[PDB]
């Protein structure tokens, strides 16, 4: 089949800011090429179509170029909404391809997450297992790093996490992370608590409780 | 086997199959090719084949030869995609195009396991009690060990949209989810405002309104 090559993979761009991703064909396909644009949960949206014609409606900002093999997508005062998943597409040749997609995040300045920490709940515990959660709210960027600690025991392989989709308003990020001990393991301890290191905090914050109650 | 309605989710077990249904607008044409497309977490959009509702016409992408099977019920103007012997290289979310929107069609899941349906346990993430700010105050509902996705989570049924933290959901060692939920709001609130997390488990017809306040 026809491969169709998109880069970059991921990008960071500010608001006002212009977009350019590329989109190469392994074979020439003429203009037979369109441009989606996917928002977080959403389904993907036409932009461009026969490689340079805007769909009714899509703002100037977008613009669709190229002929043959080379085909770009530029986006022009990136709003904070334009946040999403960016494909190409070629038609020309069966099977019809996609290209492999451009995460578009917006870059902001930096803000450090608010934390918060909270016990397992008397109705978990009573089914056995513990779960203790931390939670990061809206920061940026996302990179952060979450170590929760038991006795000032620093812990491993016992937590997962999850972040949230950038915030289409003020372009912010959240994350949860949860520590599971069985309920035996739980009270073999004191100290819980969840140290987070973040680049808007000079120093890492940490939230913690006593098992109690 | 399974019948999946556009937009919804279903689970299916391997070797079995599924068929998902996606109707016309209904809008006169000559032809009315709609596409099937194929999405995957990690993975590149893969087209596998269009249908013409109108003369029943196909053309497959020879890789999902094999798999799909493109039909469409002309008296009720409804395409339909069989998908046969299933892998978990068929869990993924599928997309049917119409020509007259520029949005796709919904998109509708499926999830290929042989691990039976679990409904989940719904627990508090209370407000920091007896060592409560004056600020902003942060809780939620922890929803945990169930199967299949998806679950879904709003707050006052709907009447509670700011500062709403809804995460992706977590696949555990035990091949269960576990999804959580917050909000944050003000600290003051708490001795008046009343917050409950509305759950939801489809698959399994569960159904959990969950108030949630400081513990005492
Ligand atoms: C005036 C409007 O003219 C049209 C938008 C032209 O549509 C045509 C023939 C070209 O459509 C392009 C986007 C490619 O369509 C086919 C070959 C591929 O279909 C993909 C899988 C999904 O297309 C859907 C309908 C577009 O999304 C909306």
């Known amino acids: 089949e026809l491969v169709m090559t998109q880069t970059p993979k991921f990008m960071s761009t500010s608001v006002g800011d212009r977009v350019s991703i590329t989109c190469k064909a392994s074979?020439?396909?003429?203009?037979?090429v369109a441009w989606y644009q996917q928002k977080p949960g959403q389904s993907p949206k036409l932009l461009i179509y026969?490689?340079?014609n805007r769909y009714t409606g899509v703002p100037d900002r977008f613009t669709g170029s190229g002929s043959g093999t080379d085909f770009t997508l530029t986006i022009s005062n990136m709003q904070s909404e334009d946040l999403a998943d960016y494909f190409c597409?070629?038609?020309?040749?069966?099977?019809?391809?996609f290209g492999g997609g451009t995460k578009v995040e917006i870059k902001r300045t930096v803000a450090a997450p608010s934390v918060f920490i909270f016990p397992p709940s008397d109705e978990q515990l009573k089914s056995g297992t513990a779960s203790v959660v931390c939670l990061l709210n809206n920061f940026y960027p996302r990179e952060a790093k979450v170590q929760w600690k038991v006795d000032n025991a620093l812990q491993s392989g016992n937590s997962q996490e999850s972040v949230t989709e950038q915030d289409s308003k003020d372009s912010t990020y959240s994350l949860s992370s949860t520590l599971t001990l069985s309920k035996a393991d739980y009270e073999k301890h004191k100290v819980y608590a969840c140290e987070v290191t973040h680049q808007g905090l000079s120093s890492p914050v940490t939230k913690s409780f006593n098992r109690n109650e | 086997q399974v019948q999946l309605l556009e937009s919804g989710a279903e689970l299916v077990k391997p070797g079995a199959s599924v068929k998902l249904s996606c109707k016309a607008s209904?809008?006169?044409?000559?032809?009315?090719?709609m596409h099937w497309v194929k999405q995957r977490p990690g993975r590149g959009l893969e087209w596998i084949g269009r249908?013409?509702?109108?003369?029943?016409?196909?053309k497959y992408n020879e890789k999902f030869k094999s798999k799909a099977t493109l039909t469409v019920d002309k008296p009720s103007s409804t395409a339909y995609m069989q998908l046969s012997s299933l892998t978990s290289e068929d869990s993924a979310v599928y997309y049917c195009?119409?020509?007259?929107?520029?949005?796709w069609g919904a998109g509708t899941t499926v999830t290929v396991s042989s691990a039976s349906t679990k409904g989940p346990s719904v627990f508090p993430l209370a407000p920091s009690s007896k060592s409560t700010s004056g600020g902003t105050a942060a809780l939620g509902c922890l929803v945990k060990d169930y199967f299949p996705e998806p679950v879904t989570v709003s707050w006052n049924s709907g009447a509670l949209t700011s500062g709403v933290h809804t995460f992706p959901a977590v696949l555990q060692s035990s091949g269960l989810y576990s999804l959580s939920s917050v909000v944050t709001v003000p600290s003051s609130s708490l001795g008046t405002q009343t917050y409950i997390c509305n759950v939801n488990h489809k698959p399994s017809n569960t159904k959990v309104d969950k108030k949630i306040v400081p513990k005492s």
């Open positions: 195009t119409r020509r007259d929107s520029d949005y």
């Open positions: 209904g809008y006169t044409f000559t032809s009315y090719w």
């Open positions: 249908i013409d509702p109108n003369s029943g016409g196909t």
């Open positions: 074979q020439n396909v003429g203009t037979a």
């Open positions: 026969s490689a340079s």
């Open positions: 597409q070629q038609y020309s040749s069966y099977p019809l391809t």
